[PDB]
Structure formats: structure tokens, C-alpha cells
Symmetry: D2
Amino acid sequence: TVPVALVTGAAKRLGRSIAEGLHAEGYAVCLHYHRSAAEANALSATLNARRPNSAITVQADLSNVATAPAPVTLFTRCAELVAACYTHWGRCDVLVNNASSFYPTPLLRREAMETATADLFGSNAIAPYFLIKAFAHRVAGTPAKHRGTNYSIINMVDAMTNQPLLGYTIYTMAKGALEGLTRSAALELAPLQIRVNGVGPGLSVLVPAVWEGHRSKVPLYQRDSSAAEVSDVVIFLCSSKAKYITGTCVKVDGGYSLTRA
Amino acid sequence: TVPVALVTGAAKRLGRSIAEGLHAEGYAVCLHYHRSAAEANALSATLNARRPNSAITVQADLSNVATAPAPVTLFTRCAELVAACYTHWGRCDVLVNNASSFYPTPLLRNREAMETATADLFGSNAIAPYFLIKAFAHRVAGTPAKHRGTNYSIINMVDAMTNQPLLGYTIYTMAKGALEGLTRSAALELAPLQIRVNGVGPGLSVLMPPAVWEGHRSKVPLYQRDSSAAEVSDVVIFLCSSKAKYITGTCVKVDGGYSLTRA
Amino acid sequence: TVPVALVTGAAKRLGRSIAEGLHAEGYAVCLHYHRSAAEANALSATLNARRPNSAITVQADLSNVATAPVTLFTRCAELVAACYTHWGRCDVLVNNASSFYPTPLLRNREAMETATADLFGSNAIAPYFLIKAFAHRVAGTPAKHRGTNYSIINMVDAMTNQPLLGYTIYTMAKGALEGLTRSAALELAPLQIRVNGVGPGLSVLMPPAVWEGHRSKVPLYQRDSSAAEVSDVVIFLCSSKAKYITGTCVKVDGGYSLTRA
Amino acid sequence: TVPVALVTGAAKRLGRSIAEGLHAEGYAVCLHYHRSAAEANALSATLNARRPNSAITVQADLSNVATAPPVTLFTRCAELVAACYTHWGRCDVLVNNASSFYPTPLLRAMETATADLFGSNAIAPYFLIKAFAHRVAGTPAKHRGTNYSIINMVDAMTNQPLLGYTIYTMAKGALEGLTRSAALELAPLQIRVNGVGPGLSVLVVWEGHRSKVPLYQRDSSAAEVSDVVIFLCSSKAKYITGTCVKVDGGYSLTRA
Ligand SMILES: NC(=O)C1=CN([C@@H]2O[C@H](COP(=O)(O)OP(=O)(O)OC[C@H]3O[C@@H](n4cnc5c(N)ncnc54)[C@H](OP(=O)(O)O)[C@@H]3O)[C@@H](O)[C@H]2O)C=CC1
Ligand SMILES: NC(=O)C1=CN([C@@H]2O[C@H](COP(=O)(O)OP(=O)(O)OC[C@H]3O[C@@H](n4cnc5c(N)ncnc54)[C@H](OP(=O)(O)O)[C@@H]3O)[C@@H](O)[C@H]2O)C=CC1
Ligand SMILES: NC(=O)C1=CN([C@@H]2O[C@H](COP(=O)(O)OP(=O)(O)OC[C@H]3O[C@@H](n4cnc5c(N)ncnc54)[C@H](OP(=O)(O)O)[C@@H]3O)[C@@H](O)[C@H]2O)C=CC1
Ligand SMILES: NC(=O)C1=CN([C@@H]2O[C@H](COP(=O)(O)OP(=O)(O)OC[C@H]3O[C@@H](n4cnc5c(N)ncnc54)[C@H](OP(=O)(O)O)[C@@H]3O)[C@@H](O)[C@H]2O)C=CC1
Ligand SMILES: COC(=O)C1CCN(C(=O)c2ccc(N(CCCO)Cc3cnc4nc(N)nc(N)c4n3)cc2)CC1
Ligand SMILES: COC(=O)C1CCN(C(=O)c2ccc(N(CCCO)Cc3cnc4nc(N)nc(N)c4n3)cc2)CC1
Ligand SMILES: COC(=O)C1CCN(C(=O)c2ccc(N(CCCO)Cc3cnc4nc(N)nc(N)c4n3)cc2)CC1
Ligand SMILES: COC(=O)C1CCN(C(=O)c2ccc(N(CCCO)Cc3cnc4nc(N)nc(N)c4n3)cc2)CC1
């Protein structure tokens, strides 16, 4: 009776608001983290205090690399994340692919580039593929009679990547791949009634002289969004209200994509 | 202190579902109709029964023509629709441009019914959306900022399947493509008044020989069926809600994945 | 023997350049104009000098207004009639004519009714009616007498997904024209009529700092295009080389659509 | 000198037709291949028989795997661009054609599919683009060519995904993101970056697939695609950048 969400990069910022919002709706929440161990553990205790046995935390590098104990592939670590929900609670109804690295990969003007490829592509595109695969296998290997009634996968994409940010080619490619995954997984998982949608923020919860300048670009309100302005949309899309939506991406950008230089 | 929604073509189908959903969230609803008087009036009696003074009905042909006098323009009729909300309740917070003509206009056939077809399919789908949006905008801009609503939201009912056009339906496909540009253009220009403008684009909703109903339905990837009206209108209500307040300029497909298909 | 093109708003700027490039490729050209009868008579003369009986001129208002009543749809069949009249054919239609002026929502009834018919007539309604006229003509040519390369190009706008503030009527009419392209492409494919769009950004563009400011924002070259930068694309899409391309819109915009405020 | 084009996967089919097309236009062509040595070398022979010194061949696995001396994909790709500069001193045009294509079903190792499908389609194209841009950047303004053009071969139909081809579809989506981001970033150096998206092309159970095509009810010939790649590289398309041109006979307009 209590559904389970797995939220990647759940420790802070938008991933934390997504986990908080799903939890508010009655979900048990698997809080994935990579480096933010203290934040993830504090968030868990907050939600477990509000509602016993309502949250767990699991650590994984979603980079496209191996990790030592066979060195452990990204694939294995992805199946293991999904397995953690099944092991704790016997289900996993919602997957939010939120975790994402983001930093410049300039084409113009070290082995960091292999590091960058692995990290940006892994977190943003390849781990989402492997997570959705493990998610879908687990639904597929549940007898029909016992399947949940509202399986939902949300990919966090980017409303502004048709208007790329100068110098972020690999990240922009990765988001594009992610949008690809949304359409391909919606089509292919439809027979198991698993919906696959994207949410794309424009500017959200910006870190002062420059904050002010970015803020002023947004037609609506001339500010970046709050975390909850994004997560409320994620929450709606996972709801039974949205049960006819799949294969689609929703921009939550204040009209930022409508602007031109 | 009760919010007001104007829903066009509210009498039946999707427009009635949207009207009932907004009503359920505590909107007073102004139900526009053209031909469907009996249905609209019964819808409004149901709503007023549930909550006094929470609905009215207004008639207007949104076809881009002049109507019965010196002659009345579509503009005027549109502005009068908005002014009906303001006359009765003193506000208009939401507008759902739902009303819409749909019928083939094939490029290859071979006369007054060519001129009234463009007027009807273009008016209902695009130009009346424009004028109602401009009349709606005018009212807000008119209100001292101290008396303005805090959640203004315009929704335009577009078509998920317009990039994959239905054979023979060119004017209709065009007018929907128009409606998408108004959605984007209005979102931009009305952002300073915090008027959000978005689209909702159904695929197959509330759909012939029945093996051809069963035939069309089966092509949708999710559930192999057309949607319920609620499956569409819940999305409309979400975009109107204060939880959607950073959303503007976007269209949301509700198509069960239909737009993902190829022949 | 010599293929015919019909080009609307052919008298100046981009439409003149399209008429020339088709003229240069050896089309006989029907130069449509509305107000600029001089410039058109001028151009006709020039190309009728390079080559006898290779250019004609034709006047019509493509606004959605009945004239002295003659409805828009008959003036459009008239235009198409005039190529078959003179030359016995019409192989190419370019819907280039377009009025363009602000129709703002805020700030500041005679005006408004005239803008609706002018902006939607010219950008959208007449193109519809012209295509209809053109398709019926081909349909009513026995197959064995049809030309081998029918091509319609609609001049759309690269930048309409990023609307120009205060231009809604225009932006809507361009989105109808996009609709027209895909819809006609699909419908006319059996006739082997190809229908495509070409979408300029800033082309052949207040205080000089303003002009420069606008030009400065184009990523590639930091300027507006020339007529020929656009007309070359049009002529390619009409060439037998593009014979597998229908239903598609080609941006010619120097990257401008890739920018954000 | 004559301008030079690098075409990846140039041995057969579209990639050969492109090579041929640019050659017939006056380009000297670097013909990249992976497994099709014999075909690549026959092409080059025909090409050099036509105009001496106008074709060469280079082999490279564009899968994202560290190869044997270990040699990474970055290195392989940079070297590929250096082969142009080494033999002809210039590289004017890059066509990212090379592409692996096979199912990666979500419902029925993965390691190799991922490195191969994302490398050929997405990660190699980026390193190739970056190598190209670095070689242009480092050329003194005075001696830079006057018509830099990069063509990504994308897919017109990827918004309408082929069931079971998730990784391929993702990789062509990455390649679309590369087209735009590289077009923006390399615009100041006057390198245009564009995509061409085939529908069904040169289908190798077939009349079923091609009858879905609105225009002519067939798949395209190889020329009906390469001619488009040729035009976009030409100076007549010098204002077109960031753009993808579908060449699909209208197939992307269909629905089930
Ligand atoms: N903020 C904005 O304005 C925008 C956001 N978005 C998208 O929304 C999503 C959420 O945004 P935001 O909150 O700003 O994200 P953040 O950049 O703050 O990061 C989210 C989390 O991702 C995790 N992560 C990063 N790299 C890896 C990796 N290699 N392996 C595993 N986990 C990793 C980190 O977890 P940990 O801290 O535990 O290491 C991090 O806290 C992202 O997908 C982003 O692309 C899109 C548009 C703009
Ligand atoms: N149903 C579907 O599968 C899809 C629907 N949509 C869109 O969703 C919306 C609602 O769809 P649906 O419920 O099927 O729409 P309907 O065709 O059922 O029409 C809704 C109402 O539009 C009104 N209307 C039509 N023309 C005019 C006009 N000239 N002037 C005034 N009102 C007019 C009618 O009111 P009356 O009866 O009072 O005369 C009608 O009941 C539309 O905008 C539609 O295009 C999009 C794609 C798919
Ligand atoms: N130039 C640019 O930057 C851009 C251009 N485009 C599109 O490219 C095309 C050409 O651009 P450009 O040359 O600058 O356009 P212009 O503004 O120069 O106009 C083209 C011609 O359209 C004709 N026209 C205008 N209104 C009417 C009408 N009501 N009835 C009949 N003919 C009419 C005029 O003919 P006459 O003079 O004979 O009256 C005019 O010369 C247009 O479709 C435009 O929308 C798109 C984006 C930007
Ligand atoms: N043909 C079609 O209908 C469609 C094609 N396209 C796109 O058009 C382009 C050309 O299509 P098409 O000619 O059919 O392509 P092919 O499937 O024939 O592949 C082209 C070449 O790619 C090379 N290649 C494949 N994998 C690798 C790799 N791991 N490393 C290096 N080279 C590799 C091969 O080289 P070698 O043979 O030497 O090993 C191959 O011959 C592709 O990018 C494709 O996605 C788009 C959609 C439809
Ligand atoms: C504000 O920081 C500063 O003061 C300066 C330091 C350098 N700097 C940036 O690194 C930067 C940071 C965030 C930016 N964001 C605007 C959205 C662009 O997509 C915020 C954003 C944040 N974190 C993010 N994390 C993921 N995984 N993905 C995303 N998109 C993301 N985005 C843009 C540029 C801007 C100026
Ligand atoms: C009297 O009708 C007949 O003779 C039949 C044969 C022809 N015929 C159609 O052409 C037809 C009807 C409805 C169709 N719908 C599919 C959605 C297309 O967008 C359902 C749909 C319904 N009503 C609709 N009303 C608006 N205002 N807009 C929409 N899109 C709409 N759509 C499609 C084709 C079915 C009915
Ligand atoms: C101080 O600031 C100013 O000077 C303002 C004065 C008013 N103003 C303009 O008049 C104006 C004029 C032409 C503009 N063009 C390109 C912008 C479109 O994104 C040039 C263009 C020309 N003529 C055109 N004619 C058709 N039929 N269609 C097209 N698209 C068209 N376009 C832009 C703005 C904007 C700014
Ligand atoms: C009778 O059953 C069989 O033998 C089937 C075996 C599996 N099978 C396919 O794998 C297949 C092959 C070619 C297909 N093409 C239509 C375009 C799909 O996007 C042609 C295409 C060709 N080669 C290609 N190579 C790259 N690198 N990329 C592309 N897209 C590509 N496409 C589609 C499916 C269908 C035939």
C-alpha cells in the first residue's frame, strides 16, 4: 500500500525537494548519494522521524567507470540501487534520475577529458539507461497480479539545452541523450504501463553580482525558480492524475527558453 | 475572493471535464457555448446546485465573422465574454481556450463554405484565442496591482499530433500551429503581469465502425486506448494551480505516447 | 521546355533574390507583387533582357480581404492561372510575401481588423490557397504531361519559437505556415509535389549602435544574412538534388536560434 | 591547395556516396574505415586514378575503448585529423558518418554495446570535432581556409524511436546536442556545424518498410542523401549553422 521512489542525487537542492515532495505524498524514498553522505543521512533522519521506516540512503558513483570491491561496473552498481529498494520494501514504483554532474568541457582554448566523459555521460545518460533497465526488469519479473498500479520514471533534463551554454558540450550532449532515453523508454515500457517523462528546469536555486544578472533574464518573475517550483512538477507527473502522460518532457523555465540574445 | 475561470466550449467532452475539475478546486466557472445550449445550462445547474453562484453560461460564436447587429465583430464578442466574468463576479483569473472546430479541408478535391470554414476553423482555434487573450490581458493590466489576482493562468488546448498531421485536415492543422505560436508569444509578452500561458495537447481523447474505433485506439502505446476526459483535464487543472507557477510558454502532451509512433 | 516558378512578393529584398536565382537556373518566373509595381516592372525588364519571354509580373493583394467582390481564394487561383496562361506550366511556388508589423497585447479596432486579415492572409491563408491552386493544376495535368520536379517553398522564420515581443499575429501566422508545410507535404506526396520551409533569422536588416547591437548577436559572422545567403538555400530545395526532401524546414539563421537572453 | 574532407565510415553506402560527392566537387578526401579495408582501398584507387593525390585511407575503431599500443579514443580521433594535415596540410570538412546500429532492448556485453554505439555515434564525433577545431584555431588567421564545415549524420526518425534501439537513439540525441553546442562555440572561427538526418536509406520484408515512405513509397538512394551533405558544405550554405536537415521523404510526418 505504500509506494517506493528511488531518487538519485537526493541529498540536496532539487533532488532533495523531489524526495521531500514524494515523501509528503506518502512514498517511501530511497535517497541515493555520491559525495553528500552527511546531507543524505540528515535528510533520511528527518523523513524517518516524521514517518518511521519511510527513508533509506544508498551510495553510488554513477560515473561510467568501474569501482573496486571483478572491478564493479556502472551497470552492476545501477542494478544494486534498484535492488536496495526491492530488498528493503519489496517494491520500487518511481525512479527519478536527478543526479547529474555539470562543469565545462570547452572545445576551444590532461586525462581529465576521459574523466569528464565518464562522469558527465555516466551520471546524465548512461546510469539513467541502466537504472531504467533494472527498474523495468524488476517490474517484468513481478507476476502481473502483484505489480503496482502507477509506475513512473522521471528524467531530469534541461529546458535550455536547445540553446546550449557556451563550453558545456559533453553535458549538453548528455542531456540530449537523456531526452532520447525518455522517448525510447516510454515507447518500449508502455506495455508494462511504465510511464517515462522528463522535467527540464531552466535556472533553479542559483548559488551575487552575477546571480543578480542571471536572475534578470527570466521573463517570468525575473528570478531563478525555487526547488519546489521544479519538484511540484515531478510530483504531479508521478501522480495518478498524470497516468496518460508518457514520452513527454515538461519545461519549468519561467519562459527562459523563449528568449534570444 | 473566489477565483474565476472562463472555459470555452465547456458544454461537453473535454471542456466540461475541465470546467468540472476547476469547479472541484473552488473556481466559479463561466461556461461558454455556441450550439450546445441545453448541455451548458444543465452543466451550470449541476454546479450551482453544488455551490450557489459558482457558474454562469455565455453564448458566443468564435468564428471569425461579424454577427447580428450595425455589425458585431469577433473581437467585440470575445471582449464581451471576458467582460461577462468581470460583470458577474468582478474578476477573471483563468482562461481555457478549449473551443474548437474540427473537420477535413483536403487540398485535393474538384464555395461560401470555403470562406466560412477558414473563418470557423481559424477563428475557433486561433484568432478567437488571440482576442480573448488580449481582452483578458487588458482587464488585468486595467486592475491596480493592489487588487490583482495572484495566480493568472491561460491554457490553450493544442494538438499533440500536429507535427504528424492528419490527412485532409490542413486548415485545422494550421490553426493549431497558430495556437502554439500565440501560446509562446503571449507567454513572453504577458510574463510582466505574471500571466502564465501554456498549452495542453491531447492525442486521442474520448474517441466510426467500432472495429475502427478499436483500430485507432490500439495504436496508442500506453494502454492501447484513447484517454478519458479527466486524463486530459487533470493536467489543465495542474497547470492552473499555484504549484505550476514557474511554468509558462510550454505545451504538455497528453497522448499516451502516440506522438512517438511512425507508420 | 523551360520550367516555371511563381514567386510571391518578388519585387525586392529576399523575394527578388529568390526570383533571380531561379531565373539564373533557367526558370521562367512569375513575379508577384502587391504595392511595388515599379520595382517589379524593373526586375521583369532586367530578366526579360538577359532572356526574352522569361519573366512576367502579376499584382494581387494576398490579404484575407475581398477586393474590387473577388475573394482571396480566387485571386490566388488567378495567380496560379497566370503561369499556365503564359507558359503552360508552374513547377515551383515560393510563398515569400509576408507583411510584418507589431500587434501588441498591452499598451497602445480599425487597425486590429485590418492586421488580422493582412498578417494571416499573407503569411498563412493565401499560401494555403496558392498551394491548393497549384496542386489542383498538377492533378489536372495527365501524368504523362506532368513535370518531373514540383517544389513549393514556404518562407517561415527561424526565430518564431523565440517570439519577437509585440508580434503575436505575425508569430501565429508563421506557425500556421509551418503547419501548412507539413500538412501539404504529406497530402501532396502522391503527386510528387515536395513542400518545404526556409526560415531566415536576421536578413538584410534606428541609432547605428542599435543596428550594430542586433547584428552583433548573431553567432556566425555577427551579422544579418544577405539575400543570396537565403535564396541559395531556396534554390537548392527546388533543385532535383533535394528530390527526397519534403515536409522539412531549413533554418538559415547563422546560429541565432541557438542563443538565449 | 585543393580543400580536404575527412569522411568517417567512408567505405560503403552513404559514407562512400558522400566521399564520391565531395571528390567530384574538387575535394581531396580522407577515407576513414574500421573493418572495410578492401572496399575503402578500392574506393581510394578509383579516386586517385581519377585525380592523383586526391584520396587516402585511414583505419580506426571509433568505439569508446582504449586500443593496443593503451591507445584511447581521443588519441585515435586526433590522429585521424592529423592524417589530413600530414598528407595535405589542411582539413576543411568533417562528415561524422561512421555509425554502429543494433538493438539494445530494455526487455529481452552491455559494456561493449555502450562503448561501441555511443563511441561511433557520439563520443568519437566530439573528439573528432575538437581535434578539427584545435587544428583550425592553431592556423594563423592569414592561412585559414575560407569554408570550414562539419556535418553530423543524425537520424530523422529518432523522435519516433525504433523499438529496441535505446542506446543508438540516445547516441543520435547526443550527436544532435553536439551539432548545436559545437555550432555555437566554433562560430567565432567560422566553422559551420550541421546535421543531415536520413529516414530510410539504401535498405539492404523490404517493400513493407519502404511503402511507409509518403514520398515515392521507397527508401532514398545514397545520392539523395549525400547531395544534401555536399550542398551544406558548399559556400552557398555559408549562413547555415546549428541546423539539422531531414532527408526522409516525409517519413517523420507519419504516425502509427
Ligand atoms: N539547477 C539548475 O538551474 C538546473 C538543473 N537542471 C537539472 O536538474 C537536476 C537537478 O539539478 P541540481 O539540484 O541543480 O543538481 P546538482 O548539480 O546540485 O547535483 C545533484 C547531485 O548529483 C550527484 N552526482 C553528481 N555527479 C555524480 C556522479 N558521477 N555519480 C553519482 N552522483 C553524482 C551529486 O550527489 P552528491 O552531492 O551526493 O555527490 C549531486 O548532489 C540535474 O539533473 C540538472 O541537470 C537542469 C537545468 C538547470
Ligand atoms: N478529442 C481529442 O482527441 C483531441 C482534442 N484536442 C483539443 O482539445 C480541445 C477539446 O477537444 P474536444 O472536447 O474533442 O473538442 P470538441 O470538438 O468536442 O469541441 C469543444 C467545443 O468547441 C466548441 N466550438 C467549436 N467551434 C466553435 C466556434 N466556432 N465557436 C464557438 N465554440 C465553438 C463547441 O461548443 P458547442 O457544442 O457549444 O457548439 C464544442 O462542444 C480542442 O481544442 C481540441 O482541438 C486535441 C487533439 C485531440
Ligand atoms: N528579412 C528577415 O529578416 C526575415 C524574413 N523572413 C521571411 O522571409 C520572407 C521575405 O523576407 P523580406 O524580403 O525581408 O520581406 P519584406 O518585408 O521585404 O516583404 C516581402 C514582400 O511581401 C509583400 N507583401 C507584404 N504584405 C503583402 C500583402 N498583404 N499582400 C501581398 N503582398 C504582400 C510585399 O510586396 P510589395 O512590396 O509588392 O507590396 C513585400 O515586398 C518573408 O516571408 C519573411 O516573413 C523571416 C524571418 C526574418
Ligand atoms: N541508412 C539509413 O537508412 C539510415 C542511416 N542513418 C545515418 O546515416 C549514416 C550512414 O548510414 P549508413 O551508410 O547506412 O551506415 P552503416 O550502417 O553502413 O555504417 C557506416 C560505417 O560506420 C562504420 N562504423 C560502424 N561502427 C564503427 C565503429 N565502432 N568504429 C568505427 N567505424 C565504425 C563502419 O565502418 P566499416 O564498414 O569500415 O567497419 C560502417 O561501414 C549513419 O550515421 C546512420 O546512423 C540515419 C538513419 C537511417
Ligand atoms: C553562480 O555561480 C557563480 O557565481 C559563477 C561560477 C561559474 N558559474 C557556473 O558554473 C554556472 C553554475 C550554474 C549554472 N546554472 C544555470 C543553469 C545552466 O544549465 C545552474 C546550475 C547549477 N547546477 C547544475 N547542476 C546540474 N547537474 N546541471 C545543471 N544544469 C546545473 N545548473 C550556470 C553556470 C556561473 C558564475
Ligand atoms: C461525422 O464524422 C464522420 O463521418 C467519421 C469519419 C471521419 N472521421 C475523422 O476524420 C476523424 C474524427 C475524429 C478524429 N479524432 C482524432 C484526433 C485528431 O486530432 C478525434 C477527435 C474528435 N474531435 C476533435 N475535436 C477537436 N476540436 N479537435 C480534435 N483533434 C478532435 N479529434 C480523427 C479523425 C471520424 C468520424
Ligand atoms: C531602438 O530599438 C529599435 O530600433 C526597435 C524598433 C522596432 N523594431 C523593428 O522595427 C524591427 C524590424 C525588423 C526586424 N527584423 C528581424 C527580427 C525578427 O526576429 C527584420 C525583418 C524585416 N522585415 C520582415 N518582413 C517579413 N515579412 N518577415 C520578417 N520576419 C521580417 N523581418 C526586427 C525588429 C525592433 C526594435
Ligand atoms: C527479415 O528480418 C530481418 O532480417 C531484420 C533484422 C533486423 N532489422 C534491422 O536491424 C534493421 C535494419 C535496418 C533498418 N533501417 C531503417 C533505419 C532505422 O533507423 C536502415 C538502416 C541501415 N543501417 C543503419 N546503420 C546505421 N549506422 N544507422 C542506421 N540508422 C541504419 N539504418 C531498421 C532495422 C530489420 C531486418
